[PDB]
Amino acid sequence: GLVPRGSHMASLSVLGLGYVGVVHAVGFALLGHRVVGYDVNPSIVERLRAGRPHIYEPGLEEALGRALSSGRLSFAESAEEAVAATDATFIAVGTPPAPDGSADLRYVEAAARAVGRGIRAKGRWHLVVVKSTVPPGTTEGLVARAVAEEAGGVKFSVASNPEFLREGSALEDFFKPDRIVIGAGDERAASFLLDVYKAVDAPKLVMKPREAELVKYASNVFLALKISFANEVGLLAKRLGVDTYRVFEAVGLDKRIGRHYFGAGLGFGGSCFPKDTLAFIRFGESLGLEMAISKAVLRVNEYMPRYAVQLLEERLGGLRGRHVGVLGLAFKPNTDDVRESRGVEVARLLLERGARVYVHDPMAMEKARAVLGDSVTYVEDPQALLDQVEGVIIATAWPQYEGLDYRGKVVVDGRYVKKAREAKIYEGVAWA
Amino acid sequence: GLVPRGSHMASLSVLGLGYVGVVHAVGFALLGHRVVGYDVNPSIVERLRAGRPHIYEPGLEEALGRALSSGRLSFAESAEEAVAATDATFIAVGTPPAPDGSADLRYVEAAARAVGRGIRAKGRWHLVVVKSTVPPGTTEGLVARAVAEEAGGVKFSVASNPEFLREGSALEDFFKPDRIVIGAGDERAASFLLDVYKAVDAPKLVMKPREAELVKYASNVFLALKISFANEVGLLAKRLGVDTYRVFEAVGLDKRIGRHYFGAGLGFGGSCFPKDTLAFIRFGESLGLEMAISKAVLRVNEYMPRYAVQLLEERLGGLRGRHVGVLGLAFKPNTDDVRESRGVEVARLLLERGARVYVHDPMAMEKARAVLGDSVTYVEDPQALLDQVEGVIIATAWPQYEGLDYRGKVVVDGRYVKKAREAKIYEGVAWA
Ligand SMILES: O=c1ccn([C@@H]2O[C@H](COP(=O)(O)OP(=O)(O)O[C@H]3O[C@H](CO)[C@@H](O)[C@H](O)[C@H]3O)[C@@H](O)[C@H]2O)c(=O)[nH]1
Ligand SMILES: O=c1ccn([C@@H]2O[C@H](COP(=O)(O)OP(=O)(O)O[C@H]3O[C@H](CO)[C@@H](O)[C@H](O)[C@H]3O)[C@@H](O)[C@H]2O)c(=O)[nH]1
């Protein structure tokens, strides 16, 4: 119902406007806060000011137009000005893999220094909140230090507040999160973020900054582990002539086991799970730990796309000169994102084996071309792609794929499409 | 409410009266079936006829007395007579590890031959149901063959119907299972078991016998995997000075992740998880598969008790001649079962390092003596044990342990007891 009197409107900035940053910036404005965003790329800022998302995310264009109409969302000309105009800054810049697989923290360090400069100009207390996925210790270590080194002696507080948004449903996960984790460096940080999130109906857990940072890796690596476990069990089910999805239907009814994320197939792609899992392994190894399960998780994941190509190659009797399609290039359905896409990886493996490769995706073909260029043929109609190839690998289960005519084709199914069983030869990547 | 007319009373036999067999025998009788049980050990049968459970299981003595009073439960003088007097036989004998870690199937094979002899004497169709944890393929392979080889040509059907009972809550899991899995070798098998379970309100999934067998290993190994994952994450949390249980409180709120079985500590013992995990690995390796995650699961598990002893040894500056206690010998709370107990394993490691070892358990000390003999001192009062030792390892979180006085002691906590933090030195085995 009604808003209680004296219910404070917070002034928040967000640095880094990938899907995490732009969904928080828009969402906080729609929750009732004044938000100032900034990104290193001026064309992102220009597009966002115009109400035109630079990335595809269901419902974002309308949430953005609503946040802009409220007058509560704006964008700054520099990181420092966004910071100086607000009381807390969410750092949401990327943490891509470094060359040795550890987390690359240079983007977070530059954003923290910008925060320190804005604080110095503001002259009063500010909260620095790390939304970026960063190894435990980064918030009170690197970020607090980089901020202090620029802040000219102005006092501030830090907090880790990890994010759990999934691409494809980020706005819903923003408004209805399963839980909010606040790793506050002090009481004033904790009370400020509990205020920021007061309108969100979800459990709020306040803990140390290190614990909150570890929650994020433990969560993402455990999801990756369910997927790789389903694939390990699936290789076995496939040898037994059994349906791995029916097995995990029964496994998931146990009240101790989550029924989701046992979707065996080509494995996980996207810009999070592969690189967070690798960062987690490298971080543990830097402390002398073996990380044996987490490494196994990645070994299975890296194997699956090679196995899918080996199945196709065995069924066709070699791939050189053969006409082969890949259905699906986005890293999952309903995005145009190809980062770490298993479909792209499968196309490359096919190419490296002398196949003539055709690809389709309902959304990601422009992004995939950015990566594959003219090395493949891009087909606009997925049926037309099937009609042209001898063999096909299904790499993303777009709903339109369920209705295609696979009859007479050799199909290596990497995502479980029930209709594909009608094929002349059906090979499940991790099931019979 | 009322029982519909013509609601058939099934005649069922059970071979093998460990906790699975005796809980099914009693439970089926209480559901309304006529049950005939048998076990290779005549003293078990004699005790059960007298209403005296040979094993400790909460509520069993009363369920048994009720099943016996109904007149519906009896016990045979031989496996063959139990079989010949019924229409379906649940095989529930053990499947311990063989010398090379694979499943030992000799107990199941002998029970299946007995079933075949009873069928031959009966002269008409019978259902053979495998409740034993057996590798996929065993029901329609070894068991169907061993039955046919003795049945003299009498027709029969087979089914895998795995069991998911936990020790300590087996009667409740019997009456209120999360799901019933029926891997029927034909339609008549499926319809017979759906009848047997008609009064149990739970989802019933009918599938191939191989799929049902694989569900059981996938479920038990996945639970073991959660535990080992919590321990892998816990070694890391401990290096960070963080509380792993608070981390997995937050991880478990994700709607994709089951909140249970992330109890980091000394790892899993008991007669199921260690040997089923090892059987699963050996079964996959027999088909040429690497089983990398499942092996990692066991590597972490085998490490934890060694690590706990290493922590104690480091804190005390060597263990030779030192007086050290183990609190907890049962493999989990509320049983007297010590099979594969981590407490026993820790006592042995301590012994092998020249410690003078004291042990306590509220129930399992007689069973543990069967294993450790006079190599340790058995202490009746756990406080008295603490008062006598310099260092202690907590290996089973019996509720009475939460109230003890650990002040001034060196404690390596293997199970998360909050009160133990009052110790002079507190080392969590997998947390700070
Ligand atoms: O059962 C499954 C589920 C997913 N996937 C694959 O796993 C990858 C990741 O999928 P998803 O979790 O939807 O994508 P993200 O948007 O990368 O979301 C993850 O990464 C975000 C960034 O850290 C976290 O906030 C989210 O909680 C976590 O889901 C995709 O390639 C999926 O196709 C499977 O192979 N099998
Ligand atoms: O978070 C946890 C939970 C359990 N344990 C340990 O794991 C072992 C197994 O515990 P539990 O699952 O209670 O014992 P079981 O009676 O061995 O039950 C398992 O094995 C039965 C036999 O197959 C299956 O039916 C059950 O579903 C499965 O729980 C014990 O040593 C526990 O102390 C942990 O270390 N951490």
Side-chain angles (χ1 to χ4, degrees), chain A residues 178 232 239 255 287 293-294, chain B residues 178 232 239 255 287 294:
Chain A
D178 289 344
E232 181 156 304
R239 299 295 206 82
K255 283 166 178 190
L287 301 169
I293 299 173
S294 304
Chain B
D178 289 344
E232 181 156 304
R239 299 295 206 82
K255 283 166 178 190
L287 301 169
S294 304

Side-chain angles (χ1 to χ4, degrees), chain A residues 375-399:
Chain A
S375 71
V376 308
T377 312
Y378 304 83
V379 181
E380 312 298 322
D381 184 330
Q383 189 60 63
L385 174 153
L386 291 179
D387 298 345
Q388 253 192 288
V389 299
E390 321 175 36
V392 73
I393 290 169
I394 303 180
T396 310
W398 281 95

Side-chain angles (χ1 to χ4, degrees), chain A residues 254 256, chain B residues 19-20 133 163-169 173 179 216 219-220 223-224 226-227 230-231 245 260-276 301 330-333 335 337 339-342 395-396 414-415:
Chain A
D254 188 300
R256 292 164 301 176
Chain B
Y19 91 94
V20 175
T133 299
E163 55 81 25
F164 297 107
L165 298 198
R166 321 176 285 284
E167 257 191 77
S169 53
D173 294 336
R179 72 295 203 212
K216 178 47 176 168
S219 304
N220 269 23
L223 295 161
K226 306 198 34 177
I227 295 170
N231 281 327
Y245 275 71
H260 307 289
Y261 270 53
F262 288 131
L266 287 187
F268 43 88
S271 58
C272 292
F273 276 7
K275 67 87 173 166
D276 294 333
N301 197 241
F331 86 95
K332 58 175 201 187
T335 54
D337 191 347
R339 288 175 287 179
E340 292 306 309
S341 163
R342 314 299 73 210
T396 310
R415 301 290 181 199

